[PDB]
């Protein structure tokens, strides 16, 4: 299994650049193969537009990841095959992403000016 816990410093798990498989031949008590708890700055797992990760066995656990949107978690379920036809994943609705507004609105640039050394924007 892979467990990320109290890793205050991490904003992403992308440093695991080549990780494609978690077998779950051994699991964290409660039968978890991927477990994320109390990671105060975690905003990204992997970039699911590029990364593929497979989880053979076990469940997911997500609690107290305030900057991590449930969309990222839901994308992970899809990608990893921790498929919604099967059994549960203890995923908190209230403690994942609660301190993040996720992308929502779009700001557009009204003005752009170049100089060889400068850029002025509005």
């Amino acid at each position, epitope marked *: 299994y892979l467990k990320i816990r109290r890793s205050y410093a991490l904003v992403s798990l992308s440093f695991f650049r080549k990780l494609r498989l978690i077998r779950g031949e051994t699991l964290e008590i409660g039968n978890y193969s991927f477990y994320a708890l109390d990671n105060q700055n975690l905003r990204q797992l992997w970039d699911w537009s590029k990364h593929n990760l497979t989880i053979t066995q076990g469940k997911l656990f997500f609690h107290y990841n305030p900057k991590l949107c449930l969309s990222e978690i839901h994308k992970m379920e899809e990608v990893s095959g921790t498929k919604g036809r099967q059994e549960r994943n203890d995923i908190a609705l209230k403690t994942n992403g609660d301190q993040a507004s996720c992308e929502n609105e779009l700001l557009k*640039f009204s003005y752009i000016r170049t100089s060889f050394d400068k850029i002025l924007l509005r």
Partner: antibody
Amino acid sequence: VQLQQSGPELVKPGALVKISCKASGYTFTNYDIHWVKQRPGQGLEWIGWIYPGDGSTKYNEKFKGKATLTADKSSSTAYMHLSSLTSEKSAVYFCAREWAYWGQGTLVT
Amino acid sequence: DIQMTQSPSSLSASLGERVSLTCRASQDIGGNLYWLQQGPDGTIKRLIYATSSLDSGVPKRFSGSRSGSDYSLTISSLESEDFVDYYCLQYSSSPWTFGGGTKLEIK
């Protein structure tokens, strides 16, 4: 916010003429003043800009030796001098604060 | 220099009609286009910034949109004051360039 331009400007050929653009209602120093030329019955050409803070400018190659851009931060007024005028006929020149707000126009004959 | 091709150069329409003017960019300009309106007195006013964003005070009958390299200005229901001149301008690249203009005339 007001860019209040100068002219009527009647000038003899081979002379030089200086057209002003007094800015008000905002911090002069924070924005660019762009100048645009309109040859009647026709479109708009971008001349170039000035950054009143630095006095830095960029011109359109077409207008490089012709136009000269200047700002007087003490009065928050920007200027454009045209040089060696000949059979230009007439044209209307506009300054604008980064395009959102334009001045009324100045006719040079 | 990016060339902005404005069409039609002139348009006849009546009060309450919906009309569209187009600017085609010779290079991709992303969303960096303004729509300008010029009054018969010469006063220039910006109506749209960043292709689709309406400036404060501009009547909601004005809209901007993009499809491929075609940037359009649409007046959903013409009023008598709208029968003036319109110009697109690209600010995506160093030489700022303008469309050739559209004169909107009463049918």
